[PDB]
Amino acid sequence: ENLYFQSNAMKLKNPLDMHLHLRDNQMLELIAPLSARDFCAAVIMPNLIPPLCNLEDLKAYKMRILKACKDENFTPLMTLFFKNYDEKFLYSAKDEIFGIKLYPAGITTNSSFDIEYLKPTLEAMSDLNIPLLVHGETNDFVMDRESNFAKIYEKLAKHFPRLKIVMEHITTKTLCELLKDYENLYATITLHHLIITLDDVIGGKMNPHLFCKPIAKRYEDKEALCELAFSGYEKVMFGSDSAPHPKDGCAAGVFSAPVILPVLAELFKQNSSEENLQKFLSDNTCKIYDLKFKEDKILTLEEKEWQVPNVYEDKYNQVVPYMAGEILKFQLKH
Amino acid sequence: ENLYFQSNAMKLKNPLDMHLHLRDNQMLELIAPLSARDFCAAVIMPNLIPPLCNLEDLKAYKMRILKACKDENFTPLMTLFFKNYDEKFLYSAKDEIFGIKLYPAGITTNSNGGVSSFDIEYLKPTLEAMSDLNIPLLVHGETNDFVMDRESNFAKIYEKLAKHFPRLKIVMEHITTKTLCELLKDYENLYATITLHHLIITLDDVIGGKMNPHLFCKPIAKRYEDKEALCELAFSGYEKVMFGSDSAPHPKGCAAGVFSAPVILPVLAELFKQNSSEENLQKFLSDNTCKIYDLKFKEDKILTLEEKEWQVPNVYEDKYNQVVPYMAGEILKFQLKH
Ligand SMILES: [Zn+2]
Ligand SMILES: [Zn+2]
Ligand SMILES: [Zn+2]
Ligand SMILES: [Zn+2]
């Protein structure tokens, strides 16, 4: 529609963040609202110290999140850290969790990954319709860690053709292509991997604020990621992997939470459509897991410049955000 | 060799650092001694602001270097920053300079006035005079392509320069790829320098775990097979390879460069014992360069290294600057008689 209003440049419905890190305690209080105010729900990753491996610690964490957000409507979609859980246990938790997140540890390729430890649990998960979320990286050379995990994703897809396997934060053309080879393979894509490549991280001066895992790769990889997100391909969902770290330059992670919607807005207007953004941020997820909502959350973006602050700050913590100091074209009223 | 005395009495004769950055002014006064003490000579890169492009300024900088070294036996091998010099200018400079260093436009630290074209006719007059006058072309071999491919993609350029200027000595500085290790064997006029760090680290050390800015330099450390090929050339003492540290300090993230000057000899000493011979170390650090250029010395500078542990300072301070050294805070198995 050619003519439009400054106050309504984009409208988004029930935006979901399918990969979020909210940390805990004092940090959680600082950053949860930043996601809560722009999303109706987010998959909360379980990599706390120590990791969430039982339902009592999960509920307590859920409660801390609900307190810190203070922006209902916001439903945290809870997850457990992967370990060898038995059928009885999973049956017990299915109504309490959205999924189980696997963090592989110690994988060499010539690989040394034995899925036998996983089989009983994955078989149960399949039958109970519980999705497996995976941080798909081996321990090989940093640029190859994701691509070398492709064969591990294939193996899992064949051995468990009824299990939903979400390849988290894909960053390679390899996985962009693998995604289309198996029906039960899905993926989440971050905001940053649609914009950066390795050159941004170490091509000129080293830029720690753009450092994350998996590392940003090549231009061909970035284009493959953009083609899936911009086309709204049914099996890709937005997952920020917003992962803050207290300001000291060496820890991995990008805190993109507060700038996600505005940056995606601009990105899709320039390269795609409101409808495809709507799919990438919500409809795709809703179609895959059959989600529905009682009270819709509608976010309206206004075409009014603002400068991203150099930090989001609390008494106990200071976090540098993605795009810190940059000027964005769109903004939500908070 | 199964038996030895007091400590590993390893002698090194006339070590040469064929690729070194000494900066200027106050910085020079602080770091120059750290090299002048362990080396008898070093190729001094001209990437100053502004870059050394005339004899007057080169002499001036040389004088500054000589003062900064003081009582040390050390000959700085001077270079000019590459540009389209003519035969007349080159003829007057041949005895004042060791070589001319080519930096591709805006690829590394202080290169904005660099070469932006490798057109054969554009460079012909200069490279032919250099060829006739036996002046060598030292090159920072990287394109502006994707960071991990900058050096390998530069191979076609070194190759055309070699074919078009077959009597020119072309030194591929700080090589970091198997591609250039191999290309070195294809043309008689191709030579190379290798750094200390590139014999040791890969990209994984720089960004595999935590980002380690102290290990960040240009050309970026690459793959395991790249490092192995570099080690095979250095350890075997291959005649066309010479040690060049590319020691480059930065005042205290982060800027590109490793400041390895203070720790080169002992670190190299340990490396060559585990993987090579004292003879091959002597070749890599000195004899190869000496043979390639026909160097001679009024009096030799013999340095002895003993296995007496020592911790590397976390910084090399003074009144004007403070620099973090390579291997900072590390415990080295070898030492030089200070
Ligand atoms: Zn992850
Ligand atoms: Zn994550
Ligand atoms: Zn260089
Ligand atoms: Zn250099």
**Do the chains contact at B203 and A251, CB–CB below 8 Å?**
no
Q: Find the residue in B nearest to A208 (Cα).
A: B211
CA A233 to chain CA centroid, nearest Å: 16
The CA B202 to ligand 2 mean position distance, Å, reads 26
Q: How many CB atoms lie within 10 A of CB B196?
A: 25
Is the bond preceding residue A50 a cis peptide, omega within 30 degrees?
yes
CA B220 to chain CA centroid, nearest Å: 15
DSSP type of residue B135: P
Q: How many CB atoms lie within 10 A of CB A287?
A: 13
DSSP 3-state of B310: strand
State which amino acid sits at residue B48: L
Cβ distance B34 to B261 under 8 Å? yes
Cβ distance B22 to B48 under 8 Å? no
CA dist B114 and B132 (Å) reads 23
Q: Find the residue in B nearest to A205 (Cα).
A: B255
Cβ distance B32 to B261 under 8 Å? no
DSSP 3-state of B34: helix
Radius of gyration of chain B (CA): 19
CA A308 to chain CA centroid, nearest Å: 21
Cβ distance B286 to B310 under 8 Å? no
Cα dihedral A8/A11/A16/A22 (nearest 10)? 0
B49–chain A Cβ distance below 8 A for any pair? no
CA angle B325, B331, B337 (to 5 degrees): 80
Residue B268: which of B217, B218, B303, B221 has the closest Cα?
Answer: B303
Radius of gyration of chain A (CA): 19
- In angstroms, the separation between the Cα of residue A311 and the nearest Cα of chain B is 18
CA dist B247 and A169 (Å) reads 38
**Which of A108, A138, A142 to mutate to probe the B interface, most B CBs <10 Å?**
A142
The CA B124 to ligand 4 mean position distance, Å, reads 24
Token digits for A84?
Answer: 């060898």
Which residues make Cβ contacts (< 8 Å) with residue A9, sequence separation at least 6? A265, A301, A302, A303, A330
Chain B hits for A142, CB-CB cut-off 8 Å, are 203-204, 207-208
**Which residue in the list B119, B246, B287, B318 is annotated as catalytic?**
B246
- In angstroms, the separation between the Cα of residue A21 and the nearest Cα of chain B is 19
Closest ligand (CA of B108): 3
Q: Residue B19 annotated as binding? A: yes
Token digits for A285?
Answer: 């997820």
Token digits for A44?
Answer: 């909360």
A143, A218, A249 ranked by CB distance to B211: nearest? A249
A143, A205, A250 ranked by CB distance to B148: nearest? A143
CA dist A41 and A22 (Å) reads 13
Distances (CA, A) of A77 to A34, A290, B11: 16, 14, 67
> Given its phi and psi angles, is residue A129 left (phi above 0), alpha (psi -120 to 50 degrees) or beta?
left
CA angle A271, A276, A280 (to 5 degrees): 110
Q: Residue B23 annotated as binding? A: yes
CA dist B113 and B101 (Å) reads 12
The CA A133 to ligand 1 mean position distance, Å, reads 9
The CA B244 to ligand 4 mean position distance, Å, reads 9
CA dist A116 and B172 (Å) reads 50
CA dist A148 and A136 (Å) reads 9
CA dist B243 and B194 (Å) reads 5
CA dist B327 and B338 (Å) reads 18
Cβ distance A265 to A10 under 8 Å? yes
SS3 per residue for chain A = CCCCECCECEEEECCEEEEECCCCHHHHHHHHHHHHCCCCEEEECCCCCCCCCCHHHHHHHHHHHHHHHCCCCCEEEEEEECCCCCHHHHHHHCCCCCEEEECCCCCCCCCCCCHHHCHHHHHHHHHCCCCEEECCCCCCCCCCCCHHHHHHHHHHHHHCCCCCEEECCCCCHHHHHHHCCCCCEEEEECCHHHCCCHHHHHHCCCCHHHCCCCCCCCHHHHHHHHHHHHCCCCCEEECCCECCCCCCCCCCCCCCHHHHHHHHHHHHHHHCCHHHHHHHHHHHHHHHHCCCCCCCCEEEEECCCEECCCCEECCCCEECCCCCCCEECCEECC
Give the residue numbers of the binding site of A for Zn(2+): 19, 21, 101, 135, 169, 241
Cβ distance A264 to A328 under 8 Å? no
CA angle B148, B154, B157 (to 5 degrees): 170
Which residues make Cβ contacts (< 8 Å) with residue B287, sequence separation at least 6? B237
Cβ distance A228 to A238 under 8 Å? no
CA dist B234 and B253 (Å) reads 31
**Do the chains contact at B204 and A250, CB–CB below 8 Å?**
no
CA angle A252, A256, A262 (to 5 degrees): 160
Token digits for A282?
Answer: 């919500």
The CA B127 to ligand 3 mean position distance, Å, reads 20
DSSP type of residue B131: H
Q: Find the residue in A nearest to B256 (Cα).
A: A205
Q: How many CB atoms lie within 10 A of CB B299?
A: 8
Residue B38: which of B64, B20, B59, B61 has the closest Cα?
Answer: B20
Task: Starting at the earlier edge strand, list the strands of the sheet with B302-306.
Answer: B10-13, B302-306, B335-336
**Do the chains contact at B211 and A142, CB–CB below 8 Å?**
no
Cβ distance B246 to B195 under 8 Å? yes
Distances (CA, A) of B218 to A203, A266, B80, B136, B213: 9, 34, 20, 22, 12
Q: Residue B246 annotated as binding? A: yes
SS3 per residue for B170-227 = EEECCCCCHHHHHHHHHCCCEEEEECCHHHCCCHHHHHHCCCCHHHCCCCCCCCHHHH
- Range of the structural domain that residue B185 is part of: 1-338
**Do the chains contact at A142 and B208, CB–CB below 8 Å?**
yes
State which amino acid sits at residue A128: L
The CA B292 to ligand 1 mean position distance, Å, reads 52
CA angle A211, B254, B329 (to 5 degrees): 105
Kindly give the pairing relationship between strand A318-319 and strand A312-313.
antiparallel
Q: How far apart are the first and last CA of chain B?
A: 27
A220–chain B Cβ distance below 8 A for any pair? no
CA dist A119 and A116 (Å) reads 5
Token digits for B198?
Answer: 């590139």
**Do the chains contact at B213 and A143, CB–CB below 8 Å?**
no
Which residues make Cβ contacts (< 8 Å) with residue B322, sequence separation at least 6? B251, B252, B315, B316
B212–chain A Cβ distance below 8 A for any pair? yes
Chain A hits for B204, CB-CB cut-off 8 Å, are 141-142
* Total domains, chain A: 1
Is the bond preceding residue A131 a cis peptide, omega within 30 degrees?
no
**Do the chains contact at B202 and A141, CB–CB below 8 Å?**
yes
Token digits for A273?
Answer: 């459509």
CA dist A77 and B296 (Å) reads 75
Q: How many CB atoms lie within 10 A of CB A198?
A: 23
Sign of CA dihedral B331, B334, B336, B338: positive
- With 0-12 / 13-18 / 19 or more C-beta atoms within 10 angstroms meaning exposed / middle / buried, residue A60 is exposed
Q: How far apart are the first and last CA of chain A?
A: 26
Which residues make Cβ contacts (< 8 Å) with residue A28, sequence separation at least 6? A22, A64, A65, A68
Token digits for A330?
Answer: 């769109």
Angle between helices A55-69 and A25-36 (to 10 degrees): 60
DSSP type of residue B261: G
Which residues make Cβ contacts (< 8 Å) with residue A88, sequence separation at least 6? none
CA angle A115, A119, A125 (to 5 degrees): 125
CATH number of the domain at B45, please: 3.20.20.140
Number of CB pairs, chain A paired with chain B, less than 8 A apart: 57
Chain B hits for A141, CB-CB cut-off 8 Å, are 202-204, 208, 223-224
DSSP 3-state of B249: coil
CA dist A152 and A132 (Å) reads 13
Distances (CA, A) of B141 to A276, B102, B144, B186, B307: 44, 9, 10, 17, 37
CA dist A42 and A15 (Å) reads 9
State which amino acid sits at residue B31: I
DSSP 3-state of B98: coil
φ and ψ of B243, to 5 deg: -75, 135
Q: Which residues of A are catalytic?
A: 241
Residue B285: which of B308, B306, B301 has the closest Cα?
Answer: B301
Residue A257: which of A221, A200, A309 has the closest Cα?
Answer: A309
φ and ψ of B73, to 5 deg: -85, 105
Residue B73: which of B128, B15, B20, B115 has the closest Cα?
Answer: B15
Which residues make Cβ contacts (< 8 Å) with residue A273, sequence separation at least 6? none
CA dist B127 and B125 (Å) reads 6
Chain A hits for B208, CB-CB cut-off 8 Å, are 141-142
Distances (CA, A) of A272 to A50, A228, A280, A304: 41, 11, 11, 21
Closest ligand (CA of B172): 3
Cβ distance A132 to A122 under 8 Å? yes
CA dist B1 and A317 (Å) reads 60
CA dist A17 and A252 (Å) reads 20
Token digits for A106?
Answer: 């110690």
Question: A8 pairs with which residues across the strands?
Answer: A5
Experimental method: X-ray
Cβ distance A149 to A112 under 8 Å? no
DSSP type of residue B165: -
